[PDB]
C-alpha cells in the first residue's frame, strides 16, 4: 500500500452510497459527499433540507464565486436544481492539494437526498460530456488535474460489510477506499484485468459474454450493452436490460430451484429471510460477465457471488434472522454495474489509459467454499459488434 493516508477514507453501504469527507470554502465547511461514477457535477445541499443536518453557506466563504447561473437537473426519481459558482475544494483524505472547482449549490430538490445517509452532496466524477447544464461546466476531477500534478486516475474499493449495519455502526465502520492518483496493491488480491473505456461520457464498457453457473446466457452480445454498459458507484443494484434481465432471472431461478421464492424477491421489492447463520449461499450461482479485453480478439471475465448480488437488509422486525433483497434489476437505459458489483472488485478508472481495471477486492465477501474473481485471458472474437450504436 503507497497510497495510506487514503486508505479507508469511504464510508456507507450500496442502499445509500459511499462518501468521502471534503471541504469547500474559505474557512473549509466541512460536508459529506457521495461517490457518484455516474454523474459529472459537484452538486452540494445549500439550504435547509429535512434530511440534511449541515449544508453548504456560501455568505460564509471569502472564495466563493457566483457564476450567475442556474441548474435545472430533472430526472425519473426526482430532481435538483441550484445556482452555480466556484470556490477552493480540499480533500482532507485525499491528496495535499486545494483545488478551484464548480460547484451547484443545491436550493431545491426532490426524492435526491436520502434520510439517514450522512452525505450533503455528490461528487459526479464521470466525463464533462454529461455535465449539468452543459460540457462548458468543468467536472472537479478534471479541475483537479489541471490544477495540481495529481495522475489522471483514481480507483475505488466499496467494502460491503456482508450483513446489516444499524445507524451507529454504518458511522463508525470503514467502509472502502478512494484512492485519489493511484491504486494502492494492498486493497486487492491477484492481478489486475483492464477493460477499455468505450466512450468518455459515462464510464462506458462492453461486455461480451455473461454466464449463470458457467452456463452461457446465449444472448446476442449487442442485448448486453443495449443502449450501453457503465460502471456506476451511484446506483445501488447491477441493473440489465429488459431482455437480458428476464434471460437472467431465469436462469437464476432455474439454478436456485430447490427453493421457491416469491415474485416480490425477484422484482428486487420484498426481502428474503433465513434463520440466523443458514443462507443457503451454495443454491444461489455465481454471475460472470466477460468484459472487452485490451487486447485483439481476448476478454477477461469478473465473477459475483450472491454474497455480492444479494444485499443485506434489517428485517421488519429486527428479528435475528439474516434478510436480503434481490440486488439486480431491470433497466430500460443499458447494463448499470452497480456497487453491489463494485463491492466484489478493486476497480481502477484510469482515465489517462481510458481504460477501467478490476482485481478481486480485498474486502469482497465471501465464504469458504467460493470467491469473487477476474481472469483471463479468453479467445472472443468479433468484440466490436456488441457495442451499440443508435
Ligand atoms: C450506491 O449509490 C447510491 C445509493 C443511493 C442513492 C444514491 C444517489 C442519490 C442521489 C442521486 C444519485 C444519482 C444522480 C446523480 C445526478 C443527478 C441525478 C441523480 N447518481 C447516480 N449515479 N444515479 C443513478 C442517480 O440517481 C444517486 C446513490
Given at each position: 500500500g503507497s497510497f495510506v493516508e487514503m486508505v479507508d477514507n469511504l464510508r456507507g453501504k450500496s442502499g445509500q452510497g459511499y462518501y468521502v469527507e471534503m471541504t469547500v470554502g474559505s474557512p473549509p465547511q466541512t460536508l459529506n459527499i457521495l461517490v457518484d461514477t455516474g454523474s459529472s457535477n459537484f452538486a452540494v445541499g445549500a439550504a435547509p433540507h429535512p434530511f440534511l443536518h449541515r449544508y453548504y453557506?456560501?455568505?460564509?466563504?471569502?472564495t466563493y464565486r457566483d457564476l450567475r447561473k442556474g441548474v435545472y437537473v430533472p430526472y425519473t426519481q426526482g430532481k435538483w436544481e441550484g445556482e452555480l459558482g466556484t470556490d477552493l475544494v480540499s480533500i482532507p483524505h485525499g491528496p495535499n492539494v486545494t483545488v478551484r472547482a464548480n460547484i451547484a449549490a443545491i436550493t431545491e430538490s426532490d426524492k435526491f437526498f436520502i434520510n439517514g445517509?450522512?452525505?450533503?452532496?455528490?461528487?459526479?466524477?464521470?466525463?464533462?460530456?454529461?455535465?449539468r447544464p452543459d460540457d462548458?461546466?468543468?467536472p472537479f476531477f478534471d479541475s483537479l488535474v489541471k490544477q495540481t500534478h495529481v495522475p489522471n486516475l483514481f480507483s475505488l474499493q466499496l467494502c460491503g460489510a456482508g450483513f446489516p449495519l444499524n445507524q451507529s455502526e454504518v458511522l463508525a465502520s470503514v467502509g472502502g477506499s478512494m484512492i485519489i492518483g493511484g491504486i494502492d496493491?494492498?486493497?486487492?488480491?491477484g492481478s489486475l484485468w483492464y477493460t477499455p473505456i468505450?466512450?468518455?461520457?459515462?464510464y462506458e464498457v462492453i461486455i461480451v459474454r455473461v454466464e449463470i453457473n458457467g452456463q452461457?446466457?446465449?444472448?446476442?452480445?449487442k442485448e448486453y450493452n443495449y443502449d450501453k454498459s457503465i460502471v456506476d458507484s451511484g446506483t445501488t443494484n447491477l441493473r440489465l436490460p429488459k431482455k437480458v434481465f428476464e434471460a437472467a432471472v431465469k436462469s437464476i431461478k432455474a439454478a436456485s430451484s430447490t427453493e421457491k421464492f416469491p415474485d416480490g424477491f425477484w422484482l428486487g421489492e420484498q426481502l428474503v429471510c433465513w434463520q440466523?447463520?443458514?443462507?443457503?449461499?451454495?443454491?444461489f450461482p455465481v454471475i460472470s460477465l466477460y468484459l472487452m479485453g485490451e487486447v485483439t480478439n481476448q476478454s477477461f471475465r469478473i465473477t459475483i457471488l450472491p454474497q455480492q448480488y444479494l444485499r443485506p437488509v434489517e428485517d421488519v422486525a429486527t428479528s435475528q434472522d439474516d434478510c436480503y433483497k434481490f440486488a439486480i434489476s431491470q433497466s430500460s437505459t443499458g447494463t448499470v454495474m452497480g456497487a453491489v458489483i463494485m463491492e466484489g472488485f478493486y476497480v481502477v478508472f484510469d482515465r489517462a489509459r481510458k481504460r477501467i481495471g478490476f482485481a478481486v477486492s480485498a474486502c469482497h465477501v465471501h465464504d469458504e467454499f467460493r470467491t469473487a474473481a477476474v481472469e483471463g485471458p479468453f479467445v472472443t472474437?468479433?468484440?466490436?459488434?456488441?457495442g451499440y450504436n443508435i
Open positions: 453557506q456560501r455568505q460564509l466563504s471569502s445517509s450522512n452525505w450533503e452532496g455528490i461528487l459526479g466524477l464521470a466525463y464533462a460530456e454529461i455535465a462548458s461546466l468543468e496493491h494492498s486493497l486487492y488480491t468505450r466512450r468518455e461520457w459515462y452461457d446466457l446465449k444472448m446476442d452480445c440466523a447463520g443458514t443462507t443457503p449461499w451454495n443454491i472474437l468479433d468484440m466490436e459488434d456488441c
